Write a protein that binds this ligand. Structure first.
Ligand SMILES: Ic1ccc([C@@H]2CCNC[C@H]2COc2ccc3c(c2)OCO3)cc1
Lengths: 214, 218, 544
């Protein structure tokens, strides 16, 4: 069989920069390599076939090159919607194999994380649960600290951080810090506070609300 | 144009079998090889095998020989893939993709089929409105949310007002714990249409065939 | 008086190149490279030689030694060895007939290509012909093309809808009528063998100078031509890449044994006839040894001749030469190789010498094929026959034409496979086994070593002794059992043969075999005495 090796699992680029993903095959392939673009949440979309030829419906900003074993996929004008995971695949020997997959992450200027704390709703208080939410929207880069405060004390049990993928419009990550608690514990405390430490500013952003019917 | 409409997600207990369809349209069905590619969570694409729609010419991969069985029907232009001896590794997304005979590229793919192989009971999601408090300072935009708690498997869809609008909706991935998933959704909409008009989030769970709609209230 | 002693050959080199001419054919050119590159690549050389040394060579040299020593035909030699097995000589006579029904129609195809190759623009290049469909898509045409399940190449269209016209037949059921072009081609073939056999060993032995040497020339031109082609190393890689794991399969050895046997073709009576017309003092050990080593090495270089052009063809297309070399049979040479040589400078030249090479490969072999049977009948019915040789030779030749009339049909190709797989292989293996057992066990290998000891001046080594006693009949027994156990389902040109074909095949495989148990029944049934008395006088040859 054939082993398609993409040594670089991740590649960082910016909007408008010249990006090029490599692809290493097991043996000599002549000109038999196809490049696929799988956008997050979509089916893999065919971009290049036979090393250099472009497929129909593919903008002019996507090109391909190489002849032999190593092949290269080039994007001249990276757009916000070009954010996807690119795969390379050989099409000469049975069976047809694929590459490990190269996620193209977009680099931009820093953005302040918009933090919003949420009190448990009445339908959940009715069920017998109470989850305080802390949304952190539109910031860059991904590295960000989230610290919880039930009543000023750093709460750490029951905290779940969920990072979404990068955005295809403004290239801004977004994460959710969830603090799930019981109803009995919720009606024995009032002002919840979640804070975020980012590289945009040294002082963590502090958000607070009150339990007494807001 | 060219469309490959696959089947919905499937939750099957380990050791059983499962069949996935692939309705092809928009081209001469007998003019192209029908392929199946496996994609594991976080893994690369994996070629299962192809089939010639004319005579059912299955050409499998040595890694999937006896693991997958490709069939085809010309009377409805639909290709099928059946899987037996289901394990936790088969819990992956499967695509059926069209391909010519030479050069062998995969021009058109299907939307995918989420297969979950687990003996865990199909648990309906708990939809709780994540609404801002009544003491917050209403600025130029308000961020809302809806919480989806406790469900299985990962087949779930959170929509906002029949998809209008959703130009500022941040959907957070689901997290698995003790056999049950939990996710949350948010939406940033200006303050000049709230709370004047109606904003409602709709949570749909296809595996349990349930659909609970909850409207946000301050 | 009268005839008395038999005739003698005109020179040593004539009989050397003559037995080489029988040994070397089409299968040497394309069969061995395919079976080689498929079963473990270069590693296939390891068992192939073994199956040669232990199997092919001993039968070859034993047959040759008996032929030169006894100077009798395929039927008359059993009268003086084991009369009950005289039916063997008859069986071959039937077997050869079945072979001569299809083997020369292939040469007729190569002949139809050859006369159709004199045009400046070769027919199988363009699609604007009277036989192409709307699926025909060809080169020197717009690039980017993406082939379709229903699309078809101009070479496949030419071979399918013209020289074969196989689209006009549905299979074995409906194959008529007859393509008169292939009938005239094969008629010309029977003519060119008619003027090369009718006189006897002198003409076959003189035509062989051309029919056995030219294939090396054409293979040399296509060899140095195919070697200079860009990206030809792919076919060589796929051709000689060692895959030793395939050697663990018990099938591969079987394929090698069958290959070397059916490429040396011992015990068919052709070597008996070719050996009969030689000097008693003349050595034959070196003869058999060298002759085989030529057939094997010739196959080895032929592998390069094919897979170099296949490598270039896999470079212009997209590699993994196996895909461009999937189909083994008439399509590897008549379509893929022809379409490959079409994109080369002075294509008329390489085309003419290629299909001319095919005819040149079949000619010598079929000379010898007929030669064995002719010698057998002339020696079995002397005086009652030999009145003229052109009479009996004319009879067998026109008989082969009427035999090929079933093959000259539209679905004739279908029949060719049914006759190529089912009829010849099991029966020939059987008669080779019974023949080897009868010379090694009944006549006694000791007296055979005394005959060779009287022939060459020295007794054959203990190696030849143990090979004839045990290793060779086990060698044939191996292929017999492995064949009967797993007869093959066969398909040709998107058409699977009906389930009943094997039945038909077995008829054609046994309708030739019925003569030896019925002749044992005829011999043991005709002379009265007791069963133990009559079989003891029927197993011992004539004392005087
Ligand atoms: I079963 C069988 C199949 C093939 C062989 C030989 C093997 C290699 N060398 C040529 C070939 C000779 O086979 C013939 C060819 C033409 C003929 C013919 C016999 O009879 C008259 O025309 C032997 C037995």
């Amino acid at each position: 069989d054939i082993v398609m090796t993409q040594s670089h699992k991740f590649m960082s680029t910016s909007v408008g920069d010249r990006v090029s993903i490599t692809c290493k095959a097991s043996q000599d392939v002549s000109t038999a390599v196809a490049w696929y673009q799988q956008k997050p949440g979509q089916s893999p979309k065919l971009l290049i076939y036979s090393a250099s030829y472009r497929y129909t419906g593919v903008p002019d900003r996507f090109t391909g090159s190489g002849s032999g074993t190593d092949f290269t996929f080039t994007i001249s004008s990276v757009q916000a919607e070009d954010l996807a995971v690119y795969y390379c695949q050989q099409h000469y020997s049975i069976p047809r194999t694929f590459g490990g997959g190269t996620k193209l992450e977009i680099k931009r200027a820093d953005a302040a994380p918009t933090v919003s704390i949420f009190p448990p709703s009445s339908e959940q208080l009715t069920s017998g649960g109470a989850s305080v939410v802390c949304f952190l929207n539109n910031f860059y880069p991904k590295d960000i600290n989230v610290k919880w405060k039930i009543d000023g004390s750093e709460r750490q049990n029951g905290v779940l951080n969920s990072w979404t993928d990068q955005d295809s419009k403004d290239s801004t990550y977004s994460m959710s810090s969830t603090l799930t608690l019981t109803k009995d514990e919720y009606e024995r405390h009032n002002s919840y506070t979640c804070e975020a430490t980012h590289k945009t500013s040294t002082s963590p952003i502090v958000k607070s609300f009150n339990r007494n019917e807001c | 144009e060219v469309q490959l409409q696959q089947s919905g997600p499937e939750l099957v207990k380990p050791g059983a079998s499962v069949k996935i369809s692939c309705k092809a349209s928009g081209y001469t069905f007998t003019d192209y090889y029908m392929n199946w590619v496996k994609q594991s969570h976080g893994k690369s694409l994996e070629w299962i095998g192809n089939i010639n729609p004319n005579n059912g010419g299955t050409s499998y991969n040595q890694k999937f020989k006896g693991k997958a069985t490709l069939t085809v029907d010309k009377s409805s232009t639909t290709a099928y893939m059946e899987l037996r001896s289901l394990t936790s590794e088969d819990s992956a997304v499967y695509y059926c993709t069209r391909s010519p005979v030479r050069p062998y590229y995969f021009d058109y793919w299907g939307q995918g089929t989420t297969l979950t192989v687990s003996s865990a009971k199909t648990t309906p999601p708990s939809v709780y409105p994540l609404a801002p408090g009544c003491g917050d300072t209403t600025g130029s935009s308000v961020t809302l949310g809806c919480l989806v708690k406790g469900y299985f498997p990962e087949s779930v869809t959170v929509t906002w007002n029949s998809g209008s609008l959703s130009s500022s909706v941040h959907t957070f991935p689901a997290l698995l714990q003790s056999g049950l998933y939990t996710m949350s959704s948010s939406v940033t909409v200006p303050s000049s249409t709230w709370p004047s008009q109606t904003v409602t989030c709709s949570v749909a769970h296809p595996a349990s065939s349930t659909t609970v709609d909850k409207k946000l209230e301050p | 008086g009268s005839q008395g002693e038999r005739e003698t050959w005109g020179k040593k080199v004539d009989f050397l190149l003559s037995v080489i001419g029988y040994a070397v054919d089409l299968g040497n050119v394309w069969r061995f490279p395919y079976i080689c590159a498929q079963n473990g690549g270069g590693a296939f050389l390891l068992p192939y030689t073994i199956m040669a040394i232990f199997g092919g060579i001993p039968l070859f040299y034993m047959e040759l030694a008996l032929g030169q020593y006894h100077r009798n035909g395929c039927i008359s030699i059993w009268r003086k060895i084991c009369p009950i097995f005289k039916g063997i000589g008859y069986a071959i006579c039937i077997i050869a007939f079945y072979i001569a029904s299809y083997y020369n129609t292939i040469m007729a195809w190569a002949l139809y290509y050859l006369i159709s190759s004199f045009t400046d623009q070769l027919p199988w290049t363009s699609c604007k012909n009277s036989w192409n469909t709307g699926n025909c898509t060809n080169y020197f045409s717009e690039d980017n093309i993406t082939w379709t399940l229903h699309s078809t190449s101009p070479a496949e269209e030419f071979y399918t809808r013209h020289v074969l016209q196989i689209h006009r037949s549905k299979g074995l059921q409906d194959l008529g009528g007859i393509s008169w072009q292939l009938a005239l081609c094969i008629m010309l073939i029977f003519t060119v063998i008619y003027f090369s056999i009718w006189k006897g060993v002198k003409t076959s032995g003189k035509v062989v100078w051309v029919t056995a040497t030219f294939p090396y020339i054409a293979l040399s031109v296509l060899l140095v031509r195919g070697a200079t082609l860009p990206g030809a190393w792919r076919g060589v890689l796929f051709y000689l890449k060692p895959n030793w794991q395939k050697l663990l399969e018990t099938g591969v050895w079987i394929d090698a044994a069958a290959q070397i046997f059916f490429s040396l073709g011992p015990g068919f009576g052709v070597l008996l006839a070719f050996a009969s017309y030689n000097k008693f003092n003349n050595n034959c050990y070196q003869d058999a040894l060298v002759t085989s080593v030529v057939n094997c090495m010739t196959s080895f270089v032929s592998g390069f001749v094919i897979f170099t052009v296949l490598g270039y063809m896999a470079e212009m297309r997209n590699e993994d030469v196996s895909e461009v070399a999937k189909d083994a049979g008439p399509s590897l040479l008549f379509i893929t190789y022809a379409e490959a040589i079409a994109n080369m400078p002075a294509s008329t030249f390489f085309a003419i010498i290629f299909f001319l090479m095919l005819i040149t490969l079949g000619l010598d072999s079929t000379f010898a094929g007929l030669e064995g049977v002719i010698t057998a009948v002339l020696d079995e019915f002397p005086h009652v026959w030999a009145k003229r040789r052109e009479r009996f030779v004319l009879a067998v030749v026109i008989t082969c034409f009427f035999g090929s009339l079933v093959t000259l049909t539209f679905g004739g190709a279908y029949v060719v496979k049914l006759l190529e797989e089912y009829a010849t292989g099991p029966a020939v293996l059987t008669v080779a086994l019974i023949e080897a057992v009868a010379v090694s066990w009944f006549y006694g290998i000791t007296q055979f070593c005394r005959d060779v000891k009287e022939m060459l001046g020295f007794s054959p080594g203990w190696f030849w002794r143990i090979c004839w006693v045990a290793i060779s009949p086990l060698f044939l027994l191996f292929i017999i059992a492995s064949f009967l156990m797993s007869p093959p389902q066969l398909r040709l040109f998107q058409y699977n043969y009906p389930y009943w074909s094997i039945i038909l095949g077995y008829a054609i495989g046994t309708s030739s075999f019925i003569c030896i148990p019925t002749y044992i029944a005829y011999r043991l049934i005709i002379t009265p005495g007791t069963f133990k008395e009559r079989i003891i006088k029927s197993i011992t040859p004539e004392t005087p």
